Amino acid sequence: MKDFTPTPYTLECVATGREFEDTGWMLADPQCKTPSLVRAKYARRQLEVKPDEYGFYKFCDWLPVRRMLKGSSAPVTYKSKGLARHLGLENLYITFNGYYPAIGATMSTCSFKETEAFSVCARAAEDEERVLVVASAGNTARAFAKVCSDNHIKLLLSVPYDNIEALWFEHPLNPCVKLISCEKGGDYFDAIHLSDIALKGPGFYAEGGAKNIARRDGMATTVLSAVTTIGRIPDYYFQAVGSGTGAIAAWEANMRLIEDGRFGSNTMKLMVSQNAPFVPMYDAWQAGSRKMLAYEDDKARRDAEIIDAKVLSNRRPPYGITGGLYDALKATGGEFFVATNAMARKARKLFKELEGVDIYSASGVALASLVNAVAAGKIEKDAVVMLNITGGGEEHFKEDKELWYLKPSHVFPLEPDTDDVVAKVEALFA
């Protein structure tokens, strides 16, 4: 840890501005009735990037961390040559989160959710005796499983049975990581609901999803990487969204950077995207509603089965909560896009051909939205554009590797019995 001290911060309730000390894992302001995110106010007002040996923690001034964990990697930002020329753009930057050693990208789990894992796990008390509970569509689960296994952190994952192929590892994991799943046909929110049932057990505590400032501020290191590389704040931020937490985080990073002052005073326009036919946040945004629209549960689950990008389908995202995605899009003058599977597949091929690495379908959704925005005349050719490639390099990383898969200890019906779930998860760690 050489010259490290725990990051100093307080919390602010976004709805009221009330400022208070984090007593430990606060996910909300107990004094605020309306649903609201809380947001860190960092005492280190101006960011000082630490040396490369800090890995992901080089951004620790604006991460709510009490220690550093070994073996982390930061996002990498570089100026595009091939893709930029294809799109006619003069100032296209790619922030790459995954495995691409030729550019210095060494996130071995192959997605930006590694930033969440290293941030959240370093916020946790090392003497913590409760089991951390995380729900995920796959990539967050893989990152947390690896970090928690390596660090002997007790972790209960809830992942849809249909998504467990995402839970691959180079070597067997420590038994301190256990998995439960909702049955086949269930979607990400079904796994979230299952995790809420498990959390009724004493001895378990919620990671909290978008409510966890460590998750948001970890993802925001993509923007911190881009701004400190470029030397100014981009005009546009492109990211594919399921919950929207990474776009909320990008906005929050932008606000902190403006307060720092050294990088300019402009606000990046958020350009977010979903994969048709699972586009409920797009639909709510285009309607002008801060509330998610009616969406029959069975139709939503079927739509989640159709999309290529299985991580972009949350029926109950942080859209309307104060500080959530509606507020972020309003504050940034943002826009919402849809990509079909066909567009995402074209984008994956385009990125591999012109930039030299494979990317996930979710990242292809983001790139497809950039292709479409450029074709629509929305992006001036000199604009500074940040394309957040949220996952990639899995094909290269897996080559000539024998993988081990984390499989569920229990699979539960979509509406499970509470006493059954609680007894079973208690026995997993007893």
Ligand SMILES: Cc1ncc(COP(=O)(O)O)c(/C=N/[C@@H](COP(=O)(O)O)C(=O)O)c1O
């Ligand atoms: C490669 C990739 N790109 C984009 C996203 C969307 O992230 P968001 O900003 O939080 O919606 C994801 C989200 N993955 C999540 C779905 O998580 P989420 O709770 O929506 O943040 C998962 O792995 O559990 C992703 O894996």
